[PDB]
Amino acid sequence: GSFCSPDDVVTFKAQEQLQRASEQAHNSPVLRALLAESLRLFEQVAGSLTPANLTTAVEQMISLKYYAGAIQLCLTVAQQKDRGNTALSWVNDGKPANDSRKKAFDERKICYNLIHQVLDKLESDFAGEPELVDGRPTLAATKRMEAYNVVNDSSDEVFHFDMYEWYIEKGWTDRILSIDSPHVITYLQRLAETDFRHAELLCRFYTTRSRFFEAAQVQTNLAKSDLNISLKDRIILLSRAKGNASVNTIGISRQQQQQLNHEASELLEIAHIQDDLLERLVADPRIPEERKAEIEEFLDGPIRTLTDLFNDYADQANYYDLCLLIFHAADFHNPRTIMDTWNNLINQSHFEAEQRREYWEIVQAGGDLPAGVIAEPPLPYVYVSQQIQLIAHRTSLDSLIFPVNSLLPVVCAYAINNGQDASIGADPCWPIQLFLNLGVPHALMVQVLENVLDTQEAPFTGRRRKLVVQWIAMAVDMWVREVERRGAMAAAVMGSWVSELLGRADQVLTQIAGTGATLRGGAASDAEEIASLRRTVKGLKRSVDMLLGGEMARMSFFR
Ligand code: NA
């Protein structure tokens, strides 16, 4: 009638043109003409094309290596089924359900999916094909450029959003990070606090633009959020934020940087504690499986308070080393509880070391271990001091969990009351060696050891003060060596109280030897052992007396 029912007729001729193209021997002029004309006709009836006809057309074009043309049709169809951009406003309004723009967005999404298939089949068809042959570009390369041209030449905004999402999906950080546009940044800023993977992209854009503080802000908020993020992923986020806030970002005050770097440092300290707990609890043989699943639920997520970590987990499982790390992170002012925790950690470790040495002695004698016991483990005082070192390096000795005035006497007490001395082949001064190497200043050691010797608290009583004197001798000796070394150092404090202390020490030894000579059952065997200590103490009082007397102010002078 009204010639020639144009929309429904053109769509048929276009299918006829495309069918003849695929029936060809691929002689370029005829194949290009049929393809080019088929695309010409389909575009004229873009707004009317049904999803079934569009799919079959694209697939036929894909089969004939007409990638750019297929993409161009899909974009044209998308723009024609929605010339008012009802889809762009429906996305810009949060995609409210119950709305009738969903239809307009879906008709575009069918076109965008088909564009994914074109590009997918493109990289597949040319998998292994070189981009250059003999110097100039191949045919397979020019079709890749021609296709991706059509993509970057578009002004469809819902399309470019759908392509950012698609690049993210496929993992092509290659091509997305390489976009100058802010349009992609702005698109990420709205969904950054919605998904981890999107936030990570946003932070990459910030960092490469030297906007480190803004990335540290995104990462920190993401770690404090209630999104489904694992604890370890929250450790990475905080660790990155801590680094990014520690460096200058232009336009932002030093105060604002430090306050964020400090919040990220504290939360990272708590997170590591929580991770150490969760790992240990899951691996613990003495924990029932039923409970472990419950622990994994409450600890492999957002970071918990230090109270909960202590009460509900660290204290229940007697992980006293992590209790001490918790008292450090919390600035916990309570000397008595701290020392109670130190006492439990020492005793727990001693019993565990004794148990492992027993199992060993059974292997070396032929016996059988208890069922389910994995078969020369360190002496108990060695494993104990390993525990003290691991904590000290993690807390740095500046903590309130290292009050040397209380902790050194306790460790010395353990050594006496458990025979961790010469009987088993240990250095009797091992407690002093430990705290010196850890970096306790020499003056503070002698100061404590003096208080141990004056107050005579058990076990430091009677003739066991012989051992206290030996510790003082060893500490002062190292102190003297340190002063002599520091004097030679500066060529290229000690008071009279140290001298008095060595005099009293000599008196204690004279008293112990006398008491030892009149003991019931026979004289003491340590006669010459004490005579040796007397000589050492006198030698140290001599050295200290020379330093105090002027030789310390003349250490940088040539002799
Ligand atoms: Na700054």
Side-chain angles (χ1 to χ4, degrees):
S2 74
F3 59 92
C4 311
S5 281
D7 272 19
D8 199 359
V9 158
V10 166
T11 174
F12 176 76
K13 304 296 293 185
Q15 300 160 337
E16 203 170 20
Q17 295 281 279
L18 196 54
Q19 225 175 312
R20 280 174 193 155
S22 33
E23 288 161 14
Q24 281 295 306
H26 182 25
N27 65 89
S28 172
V30 180
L31 184 62
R32 177 209 56 79
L34 294 161
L35 293 168
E37 186 65 22
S38 180
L39 178 61
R40 216 211 77 180
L41 296 185
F42 275 120
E43 284 176 350
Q44 283 181 206
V45 297
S48 51
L49 280 174
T50 72
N53 295 122
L54 177 57
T55 301
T56 53
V58 168
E59 283 180 353
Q60 285 192 258
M61 291 178 182
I62 290 169
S63 308
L64 299 172
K65 309 292 185 291
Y66 206 55
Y67 310 105
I71 291 168
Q72 186 180 325
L73 174 59
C74 292
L75 291 181
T76 300
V77 171
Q79 171 64 316
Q80 285 299 311
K81 293 208 163 180
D82 182 346
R83 311 234 290 284
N85 285 85
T86 44
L88 176 55
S89 73
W90 189 70
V91 175
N92 282 2
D93 286 19
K95 311 204 206 184
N98 259 256
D99 199 348
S100 91
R101 280 97 61 87
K102 188 194 108 273
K103 179 185 170 63
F105 176 83
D106 294 344
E107 295 172 345
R108 295 184 164 259
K109 182 58 178 163
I110 287 175
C111 303
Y112 300 149
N113 290 331
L114 282 171
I115 289 181
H116 303 336
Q117 288 177 216
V118 174
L119 293 172
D120 275 341
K121 192 85 189 196
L122 174 44
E123 296 296 347
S124 164
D125 286 343
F126 302 153
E129 299 291 354
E131 224 259 337
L132 276 167
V133 80
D134 198 77
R136 267 275 191 261
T138 70
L139 187 285
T142 51
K143 284 184 171 298
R144 188 186 281 112
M145 297 190 62
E146 196 173 87
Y148 278 111
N149 283 336
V150 177
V151 176
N152 302 133
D153 276 86
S154 174
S155 298
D156 185 347
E157 235 171 302
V158 177
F159 171 58
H160 273 98
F161 293 165
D162 187 86
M163 290 296 286
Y164 300 154
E165 216 70 353
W166 186 70
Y167 290 168
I168 293 168
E169 193 201 76
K170 291 282 272 167
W172 298 353
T173 300
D174 296 339
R175 166 161 237 124
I176 191 190
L177 202 274
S178 176
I179 290 154
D180 216 325
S181 166
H183 185 71
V184 64
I185 280 88
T186 311
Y187 172 77
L188 289 170
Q189 283 165 351
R190 317 242 177 136
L191 295 176
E193 296 176 350
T194 301
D195 179 84
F196 178 105
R197 191 183 307 274
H198 282 76
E200 182 162 357
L201 257 182
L202 175 64
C203 290
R204 300 213 98 87
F205 271 114
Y206 288 160
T207 60
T208 64
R209 290 163 169 69
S210 291
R211 305 303 303 172
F212 306 99
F213 178 87
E214 282 76 12
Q217 235 160 8
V218 163
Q219 294 161 334
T220 292
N221 300 333
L222 203 63
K224 305 164 79 188
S225 59
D226 272 88
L227 281 57
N228 299 275
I229 308 178
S230 64
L231 173 59
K232 308 220 183 199
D233 285 343
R234 296 169 121 106
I235 287 176
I236 291 171
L237 290 171
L238 291 164
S239 186
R240 293 176 184 179
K242 179 176 174 173
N244 285 136
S246 74
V247 301
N248 188 41
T249 294
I250 221 66
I252 293 172
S253 66
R254 191 190 273 95
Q255 277 300 134
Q256 210 162 18
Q257 297 173 188
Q258 290 172 193
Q259 277 175 10
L260 180 52
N261 162 267
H262 189 72
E263 190 183 24
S265 291
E266 279 191 335
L267 286 166
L268 178 58
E269 187 175 40
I270 301 175
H272 276 310
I273 292 170
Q274 185 167 327
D275 195 45
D276 285 348
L277 266 165
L278 169 60
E279 298 275 310
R280 191 178 297 185
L281 292 168
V282 163
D284 196 322
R286 263 168 49 81
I287 301 297
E289 254 61 43
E290 318 292 25
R291 175 62 185 176
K292 288 185 180 177
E294 189 181 354
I295 293 168
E296 199 170 319
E297 185 192 346
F298 287 84
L299 292 187
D300 185 16
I303 302 158
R304 305 265 248 139
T305 71
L306 289 172
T307 287
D308 292 351
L309 289 183
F310 172 84
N311 291 105
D312 291 339
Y313 303 93
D315 194 19
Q316 298 285 1
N318 294 338
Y319 296 156
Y320 302 106
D321 58 344
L322 297 168
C323 292
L324 290 171
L325 298 188
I326 287 172
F327 301 153
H328 174 64
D331 217 35
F332 187 52
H333 301 290
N334 194 337
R336 192 212 149 208
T337 300
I338 283 171
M339 294 308 307
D340 290 344
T341 302
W342 273 120
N343 277 326
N344 291 335
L345 174 63
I346 293 173
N347 297 331
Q348 177 194 273
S349 304
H350 174 91
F351 175 81
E352 259 171 76
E354 302 265 60
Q355 212 169 212
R356 279 189 236 108
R357 272 217 124 233
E358 180 202 326
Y359 295 158
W360 184 74
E361 291 174 359
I362 298 172
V363 172
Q364 301 304 319
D368 291 273
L369 292 334
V373 161
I374 305 144
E376 187 175 2
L379 294 171
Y381 82 100
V382 169
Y383 182 69
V384 161
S385 58
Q386 288 165 14
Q387 291 297 328
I388 291 172
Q389 291 171 246
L390 289 173
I391 297 180
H393 299 139
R394 183 123 166 213
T395 58
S396 88
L397 212 54
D398 192 24
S399 162
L400 297 167
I401 79 165
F402 278 95
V404 177
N405 185 38
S406 301
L407 184 61
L408 174 63
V410 161
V411 173
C412 289
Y414 157 81
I416 292 172
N417 292 130
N418 291 84
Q420 307 297 298
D421 48 35
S423 74
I424 55 166
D427 195 308
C429 285
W430 75 259
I432 311 304
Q433 299 169 345
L434 175 69
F435 279 103
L436 286 180
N437 293 329
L438 291 166
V440 178
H442 299 258
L444 177 66
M445 294 290 305
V446 178
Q447 198 159 25
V448 170
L449 291 184
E450 181 179 57
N451 193 92
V452 173
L453 189 74
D454 283 15
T455 70
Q456 309 195 48
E457 251 183 62
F460 319 111
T461 52
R463 299 184 78 264
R464 280 179 299 195
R465 310 168 79 209
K466 176 218 306 180
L467 189 66
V468 181
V469 172
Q470 184 172 4
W471 292 332
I472 289 168
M474 207 252 186
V476 166
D477 186 17
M478 297 302 92
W479 194 356
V480 168
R481 284 189 155 82
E482 242 300 306
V483 167
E484 290 180 331
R485 165 148 41 228
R486 196 131 188 290
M489 183 75 68
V493 77
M494 266 192 192
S496 54
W497 70 273
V498 177
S499 191
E500 301 169 39
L501 188 273
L502 292 166
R504 296 205 299 289
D506 187 83
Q507 292 182 271
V508 168
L509 292 185
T510 300
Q511 178 174 11
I512 286 174
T515 293
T518 58
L519 285 179
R520 206 149 60 67
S525 44
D526 53 26
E528 256 302 317
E529 190 216 313
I530 296 174
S532 174
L533 246 174
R534 294 278 298 282
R535 292 186 286 275
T536 295
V537 172
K538 288 174 199 169
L540 292 167
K541 196 187 194 296
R542 185 184 177 275
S543 298
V544 165
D545 277 324
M546 284 174 55
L547 295 171
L548 263 277
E551 294 286 273
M552 194 170 68
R554 314 182 209 107
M555 289 233 85
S556 54
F557 298 171
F558 287 126
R559 292 168 180 73

